[PDB]
Design a protein around this ligand. Structure first.
Ligand SMILES: *[C@@H]1O[C@H](CO)[C@@H](O[C@@H]2O[C@H](CO)[C@@H](O[C@@H]3O[C@H](CO[C@H]4O[C@H](CO)[C@@H](O)[C@H](O[C@H]5O[C@H](CO)[C@@H](O)[C@H](O)[C@@H]5O[C@H]5O[C@H](CO)[C@@H](O)[C@H](O)[C@@H]5O)[C@@H]4O)[C@@H](O)[C@H](O[C@H]4O[C@H](CO)[C@@H](O)[C@H](O)[C@@H]4O[C@H]4O[C@H](CO)[C@@H](O)[C@H](O)[C@@H]4O)[C@@H]3O)[C@H](O)[C@H]2NC(C)=O)[C@H](O)[C@H]1NC(C)=O
Ligand code: YGE
Ligand code: CA
Ligand code: CL
Ligand code: K
Ligand code: NA
Ligand code: ZN
Length: 806
């Protein structure tokens, strides 16, 4: 109930939600059924349209007009945006040559350049080129300001998750808006797009930018716009707010356009009907820029033109039905569409079994257009697991497809030709970023980046301290002229030990054997040098990783590789080695197939043992530095040390062996040498963060050898591939992965074929940023390079996506 007896007289789009119970006049009042009786009359005037015409020039002020062409309009803050063009012979902003904005040019009383966020729903990245002829304003912003070829949204590439990610710098799993539709078991509540429940504060986690601003004394315009308020009125409202007195005027603003998404759903991403929506958005941008120019603000305000996600071609006939797979189809609840989430229809159903459901959905039809996952097995790059609102069972749907429960759902819920929501690496889902203003760079292209990074930058633009978030602060400094944030490297917490030879062979009782008893200070003083670190500048190219938590670990040097060996987890945290373009691949000799050797630098009590691997029927082992890449027959013995061993399922050893025997050489060949850092990851609670020892849910049987959930590799080389990886004078190039350590290869439907037909495709799917691996290991990489730290942060957030060109 709202007593709407009050009046919006003088309160149109007021920046405070009034003391309850009261009559409301803000952008949200329609949504709450709380607007004053005269809201439409006073605050949503339309009379005479949105443009000045010559005959209106100097008119006598008629308050009924939507906007004014009277002489006092600049003072009242309410001219139509084209007033000075039509009445004062000024030019439209788009027609002006662009001129570098070296410093903010603001009216007196402006304490900081304002920030205007102009967000566009479904604005696919390729619209910037493909629609450029019909978007002159947007094209000027783009070419004159700072732009990226595209911006990566978060998964799921839906609207609320991405807009709220833009505002918070958080992964959906952390901010809590994990889809357009949600169930929260704790609250026992549901979130729907249509309705009232979506406004309830409990859904919205983290700290959105408007709150960050407010708490730090920076006033914000309201981010939400009611759907029925036309764009022209949205623009005039922002412009009016920008004419408020100094003590009342917000410094940050948001605009939101439902287009081009709205038409994109109906007509597809490139339907001929899409041209007009693009024209219209551009016209709106033009109205903003003309309006700013009238206020002498067009060289003061920073404007961000940003999309939430792209749009893909999707039609009704391209729908997979769960009823073609499950016989028990009515015992489940499915959240459907461009992603799938499955839970039990009833929690009193004790005959509900996620494992048979997953199995019934696994590789069942030859061209199957979705893949089932337990959420913790989703590629780590999606960061889509750590929230009670995300169902244990998940379907990754192929681009261009939908999943639904039964055919009746699709015809008694074609209507639509476009949709989005797919994997955030998908080209069609990529969206846009342009920054224009005094604080952004001039005519500058920057590499693609993730939308999670923007919150930090928006905080920088406003002089705000960002709340804790998933951005890497400083990774986008290259977008900015000034206001850069100068981060320092985190301090190493644990310093390594440097163990020498301290144990005799016979002190070890590991059930390991090796055929290594085969026998001159020429090559005897030389092997001492290699164990002291004589080749370490070759295999450790960017300094050792810093360990950012309290632990006990040893640096171990070898001819071919260096490792940081954890006495706590009984294996390396990291193993670093360089493979030149010229390196030769050899096999593991017949006599050395089962060879595991005690490491006389490391105590029996801090070593693994072969017995545990013999007794454990499920678990085998692999090596971090690959024996296949040993530099000499003698060096090869080093690769068999018990301190280079890690636990591996036979099914996963298929993946790992192929990567080590075939792919590393191939990368070294294509990239002119590679440096590789591999290691284990433990994330049993799937929070994206390094497990502590007491979080490990699985051990090699009858041992304290913990089982990794994943294995990572970071593969670095020279950006200029004419220089070898170990002699690179400039910027680096990286690709990384976090492979799930699974006892089966069910995820790969082709896995019974030769590794050459499925292993690399698996690896590509599990591509990762170095930053993802940092979170997962508590390690800090690239501590010693010749590169600026901000450039290193950018490199660390890079993701190799394996899509073709946009
Ligand atoms: C991406 O960036 C984000 C942001 O930086 C990272 O997330 C942070 O990670 C921290 C480490 O996991 C986490 O810190 C914990 O906070 C607990 C209390 O936190 C509350 O207050 C904060 C601050 O305002 C608030 O942000 C939190 O909001 C969460 O919860 C509400 C309600 O559900 C949501 O509205 C909101 O969306 C958010 O949910 C998300 O996070 C929670 C985890 O907090 C998830 O469960 C959800 O799924 C969702 O993702 C909270 O309201 C605090 O209790 C923790 O402290 C425990 O552990 C420490 C060890 O240091 C110990 O000292 C304490 O005693 C305590 O242990 C006790 O609790 C244990 C569990 O109950 C119990 O087992 C013990 O026996 C003890 O009793 C902890 O410090 C921080 O909350 C989040 N922040 C956010 C916004 O998510 C994220 O990690 C980054 N991701 C990556 C991949 O890098
Ligand atoms: C929530 C955070 O809101 C921001 C953060 C920033 C930032 N940074 C900037 C602007 C904003 C402002 O958003 C708004 O005014 N809103 C009002 C719109 C209603 N809504 C939908 O119903 C909807 C639902 C499903 C869809 N599928 N496809 N299209 C869809 C559209 C999307 C909402 C965006
Ligand atoms: Ca963890
Ligand atoms: Cl959803
Ligand atoms: K075994
Ligand atoms: Na398989
Ligand atoms: Zn949409």
């Amino acid at each position: 109930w709202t007593a709407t007896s009050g009046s919006c007289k003088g309160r149109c789009f007021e920046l405070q939600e009034v003391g309850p119970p009261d009559c409301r006049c803000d952008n949200l009042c329609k949504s709450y059924s709380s607007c004053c009786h005269d809201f439409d009359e006073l605050c949503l005037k339309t009379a005479r349209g949105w443009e000045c015409t010559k005959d209106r020039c100097g008119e006598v002020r008629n308050e009924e007009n939507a906007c004014h062409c009277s002489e006092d309009c600049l003072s009242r803050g309410d001219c139509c945006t084209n007033y000075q063009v039509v009445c004062k012979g000024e030019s439209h902003w788009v027609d002006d040559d662009c001129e570098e904005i070296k410093v903010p040019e603001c009216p007196a009383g402006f304490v900081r350049p304002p920030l205007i966020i102009f967000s566009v729903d479904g604005f696919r990245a390729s619209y910037m080129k493909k629609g450029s002829k019909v978007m002159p304003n947007i094209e000027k912003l783009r070419s004159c300001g700072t732009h990226a070829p595209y911006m990566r949204p978060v998964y799921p590439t839906k609207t609320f998750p991405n807009l709220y990610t833009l505002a918070t710098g958080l992964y959906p799993e952390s901010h809590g808006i994990v889809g357009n539709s949600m169930y929260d078991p704790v609250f026992d509540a549901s979130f729907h797009l249509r309705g009232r429940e979506k406004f309830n504060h409990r859904w919205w986690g983290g700290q959105p930018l408007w709150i960050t601003a407010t708490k730090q004394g920076v006033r914000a315009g309201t981010f939400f716009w009611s759907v029925s308020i036309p764009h022209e009125r949205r623009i005039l409202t922002i412009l009016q707010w920008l004419s408020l007195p100094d003590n009342e005027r917000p410094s940050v603003y948001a605009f939101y356009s439902e287009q081009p998404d709205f038409s994109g759903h109906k007509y597809g991403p490139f339907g001929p009907e899409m041209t007009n929506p693009l024209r219209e958005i551009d016209k709106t941008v033009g109205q903003l820029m003309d309006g700013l120019k009238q206020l002498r603000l067009h060289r003061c305000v920073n404007v961000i033109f940003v999309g939430d996600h792209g749009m893909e071609d999707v039609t009704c006939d391209r729908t997979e039905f769960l009823s073609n797979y499950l016989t028990n189809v009515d015992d489940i609840t499915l959240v459907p569409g461009t992603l799938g989430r499955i839970r039990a229809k009833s929690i009193n159903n004790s005959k509900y079994d996620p494992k048979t459901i997953i199995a019934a959905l696994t590789c069942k039809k030859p061209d199957q257009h979705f893949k089932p996952y337990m959420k913790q097995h989703l590629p780590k790059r999606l960061h889509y697991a750590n929230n009670r609102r995300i169902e244990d069972i998940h379907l990754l749907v192929d681009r261009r497809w939908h999943v639904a429960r039964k055919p009746l759902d699709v015809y008694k819920k074609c209507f639509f030709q476009g949709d989005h929501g797919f994997d955030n690496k998908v080209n069609s889902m990529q969206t846009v970023f342009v920054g224009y203003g005094p604080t952004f760079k001039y005519r500058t292209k920057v590499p693609p980046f993730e939308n999670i990074e923007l919150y930090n930058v928006m905080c920088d633009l406003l002089g705000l301290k960002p709340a804790p978030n998933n951005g890497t602060h400083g990774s986008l400094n290259h977008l900015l002229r000034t206001n850069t944030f100068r981060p320092t490297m985190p301090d190493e917490v644990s310093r390594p030990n440097y163990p020498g030879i301290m144990y005799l062979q016979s002190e070890f009782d590991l059930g390991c054997t090796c055929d290594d008893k085969v026998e001159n200070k020429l090559e005897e003083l030389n092997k001492r040098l290699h164990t002291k670190g004589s080749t370490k500048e070759r295999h450790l190219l960017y300094g050792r990783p810093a360990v950012l938590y309290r632990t006990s670990y040893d640096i171990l040097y070898h001819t071919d590789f260096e490792s940081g060996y954890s006495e706590i987890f009984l294996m390396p945290l990291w193993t670093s080695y360089t493979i030149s373009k010229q390196a030769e691949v050899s096999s593991i000799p017949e006599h050395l197939t089962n060879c595991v050797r005690p490491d006389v630098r490391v105590s029996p009590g801090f070593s693994q043992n072969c017995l545990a691997y013999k007794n454990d029927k499920q678990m085998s082992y692999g090596f971090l530095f690959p024996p296949y890449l040993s530099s000499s027959p003698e060096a090869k013995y080093d690769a068999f040390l018990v301190t280079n061993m890690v636990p591996m399922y036979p099914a996963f050893k298929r993946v790992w062996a192929y990567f080590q025997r075939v792919l590393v050489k191939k990368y070294a060949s294509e990239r002119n040498g590679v440096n590789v850092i591999s290691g284990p990851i433990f994330d049993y609670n799937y929070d994206g963060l390094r497990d502590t020892e007491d979080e490990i849910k699985q051990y090699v049987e009858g041992s304290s050898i913990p089982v990794p959930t994943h294995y990572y590799s970071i593969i670095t080389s020279c950006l200029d591939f004419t220089q070898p990886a170990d002699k690179c004078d400039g910027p680096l190039s990286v690709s990384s992965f976090i492979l799930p350590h699974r006892p089966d290869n069910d995820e790969s439907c082709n896995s019974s074929e030769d590794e050459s037909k499925w292993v690399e495709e698996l690896m590509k799917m599990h591509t990762a940023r170095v930053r993802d691996i940092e979170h997962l290991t508590g390690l800090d990489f690239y501590r010693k390079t010749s590169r600026s730290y901000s450039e290193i942060l950018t490199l660390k957030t890079y993701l190799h996506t394996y899509e073709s060109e946009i």
